[PDB]
Amino acid sequence: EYPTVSEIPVGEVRLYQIADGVWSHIATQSFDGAVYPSNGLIVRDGDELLLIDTAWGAKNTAALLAEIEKQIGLPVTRAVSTHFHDDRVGGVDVLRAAGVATYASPSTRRLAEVEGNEIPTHSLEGLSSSGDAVRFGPVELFYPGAAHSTDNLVVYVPSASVLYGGCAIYELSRTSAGNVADADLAEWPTSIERIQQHYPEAQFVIPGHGLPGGLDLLKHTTNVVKAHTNR
Ligand SMILES: [Zn+2]
Ligand SMILES: [Zn+2]
Numbered sequence: 687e688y689p690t691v692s693e694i695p696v697g698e699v700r701l702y703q704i705a706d707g708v709w710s711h712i713a714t715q716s717f718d719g720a721v722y723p724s725n726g727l728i729v730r731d732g733d734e735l736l737l738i739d740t741a742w743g744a745k746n747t748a749a750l751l752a753e754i755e756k757q758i759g760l761p762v763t764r765a766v767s768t769h770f771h772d773d774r775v776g777g778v779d780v781l782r783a784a785g786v787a788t789y790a791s792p793s794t795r796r797l798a799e800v801e802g803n804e805i806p807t808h809s810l811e812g813l814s815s816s817g818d819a820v821r822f823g824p825v826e827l828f829y830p831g832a833a834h835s836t837d838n839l840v841v842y843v844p845s846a847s848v849l850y851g852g853c854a855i856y857e858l859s860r861t862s863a864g865n866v867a868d869a870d871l872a873e874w875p876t877s878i879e880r881i882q883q884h885y886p887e888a889q890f891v892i893p894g895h896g897l898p899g900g901l902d903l904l905k906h907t908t909n910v911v912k913a914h915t916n917r
Contacts, residue, residue: 688712688897691721699741699750701728701757704890704898705846707824709758711750713741715773724773725892727850728754728762729843731823737765737786738825738841738850740777747777751784762786766822767806768852769835770797771868773894778804789822791829793837813839817880828884830854831877832870834894838877842885849888849901851881856907857896863914864895871915875908 689700689712700712707730714723726739735758741750754762765781767774767790775798778788788806790798791813798805812820816831826842833854841850854877856864863869870877882904891903 689723690897691723694723696721697745697749699746699753701753704848704892705843708843708846708848710850710892710898711737711741711753713746713750715742715746722895724895725850725898726750727841727843727848727892728758729824730760731763733760734763735760736823736825737762737781739768739774739852740765740781742773743776744780747780750777751780764789764823765806766790766810766827766839766841767794767798768841768850769838770794770801770803771835771853771865772803774852775804775806778806782807791837791839794839797835797837816877817884819884828881830880830884831873833874833877834864834866835868836870840881842888847887847889848892849881849885849890850892851894851903853894854878854881854907855891855893855903856910857893858899858903858906859896860893861910863910866914869911871911874911878904878908878911 709728724742729736789808790806792809813829819828
């Protein structure tokens with residue numbers, strides 16, 4: 687039932703209900719002549735919605751808001767980007783124009799600015815040191831340490847035991863490292879272990895790209911990152 691690339695024409699977006707009041711959003715982009723899927727999260731926040739991550743670009747993110755209106759019909763009032771790369775901040779300007787309040791850590795905002803990427807409006811305090819967590823509406827935001835990027839956040843939905851790892855967590859089908867240009871390979875397993883330590887009760891774990899699974903995605907990622915380290 688989870689959608690894959692061949693289900694999703696580029697420019698379209700699918701929603702997937704994970705639990706009561708919790709969805710992923712799935713979109714695709716072409717990169718170097720291959721097509722990659724990308725996940726984000728949507729969490730019901732009373733009669734409003736919280737969005738985690740853009741749908742990887744302006745057109746996708748417009749389509750995302752259109753699909754949310756079509757299928758859920760509650761207002762997206764806030765969005766949080768989990769790190770500074772384009773699959774996470776690309777589309778922030780579309781969200782902002784549509785009246786969504788955009789958020790990221792000050793580390794992410796700064797790195798987005800350096801990269802010339804779109805920059806969320808608001809700055810999330812309380813996430814500066816590895817192991818820091820803050821509640822943000824119906825989710826907990828956690829900074830595990832540097833991993834895929836120095837700023838990467840993960841998002842937990844306590845009502846549903848859903849853990850969204852973003853790009854710090856790989857899907858099982860990914861056997862070799864993704865983009866590690868901005869990674870801290872040295873710290874990435876230590877960061878993954880902080881996630882395990884903080885969220886041992888998680889039932890559904892959503893990678894930045896590809897299929898959900900369970901907490902097995904954590905050690906899977908560590909194995910892949912450690913192999914890449916020793917390449
Ligand atoms: Zn990234
Ligand atoms: Zn990513």
